[PDB]
A paper describes a structure:
As expected, BelI as well as CysGΔN16 adopt the class I methyltransferase Rossmann fold, characterized by a core domain of a seven-stranded β-sheet flanked by α-helices.
Due to the high crystallization tendency of CysGΔN16, subsequent mutagenesis experiments were focused on this variant. Moreover, Arg22 was found to be important for cosubstrate binding, with the CysGfl-R22K mutant displaying a 44% reduction in activity compared to wt.
Numbering used by the authors: 18 to 228
Write the structure that this text describes.
């Protein structure tokens, strides 16, 4: 399933790589990290590669996806798993970092804002939130150009026609917003610094710091 993710997501290495790099420059080797909506655990695995000694908690509503996540980690790896929705109470922590990839765009805008507040509450002072996210263009005219650029990647990756059809169907349930609006929502939630680190049209890695 990993091959398909790279066919569907432009600049996979730049965007996931940027998320790992900003965490590695922000938190200690022994950081406590929550992967929020870990899915099959691609972001969690990339963090473990860079941070062998980090304490990782992988959270998702899907037991099936978390089972595929646990398969990526060695039997003796201390990685922990929690079955929970984004809208459920977050784990107590504290955490040095909270990370998410391609999950929070499924939430209503009001629930995104509430989630940002609840994440800041479980972060230590100076702690980091990182999102690798599907973002809306700021105008309907630019959204058409974002869509053409996404399709150009998908077609050039030789994506099976039925897998792109399935992708389009899943995207009817997306509630994306532009990157600058959700970065401002981090500031509104009390993150003292927020920045867009990397972007490829529809996809972006952004971060907020608690202090
Ligand atoms: N709302 C949600 N809660 C948990 N995991 C998710 N993955 C995608 N959407 C999710
Ligand atoms: Ca989606």
């Amino acid at each position: 399933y990993d091959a398909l993710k790279r066919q569907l997501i432009p600049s996979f290495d730049l965007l996931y790589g940027s998320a790992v790099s900003v965490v590695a420059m922000s938190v200690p080797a022994t950081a406590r990290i929550l992967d929020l909506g870990a899915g099959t655990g691609l972001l969690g695995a990339a963090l473990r590669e860079r941070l062998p000694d980090a304490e990782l908690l992988l959270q998702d509503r899907s037991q099936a996806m978390l089972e595929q996540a646990r398969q990526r980690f060695a039997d003796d790896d201390q990685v922990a798993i929690r079955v929970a929705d984004h809208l459920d109470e977050l784990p107590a922590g504290p955490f040095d970092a909270v990370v998410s990839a391609l999950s929070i765009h499924h939430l209503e805008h009001q629930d995104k804002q509430d989630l940002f507040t609840r994440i800041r509450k479980i972060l230590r002072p100076g702690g980091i939130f990182v999102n690798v996210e599907q973002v809306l263009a700021p105008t309907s005219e630019l959204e058409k150009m974002y869509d053409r650029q996404h399709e150009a990647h998908v077609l050039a990756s030789d994506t099976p026609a039925e897998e792109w059809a399935a992708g389009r169907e899943r995207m009817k349930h997306d509630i994306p917003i532009d990157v600058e609006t959700q970065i401002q929502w981090l500031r509104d939630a009390g993150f003292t610094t927020a920045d867009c680190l990397a972007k490829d049209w529809r996809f972006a890695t952004y971060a907020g710091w608690n202090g």
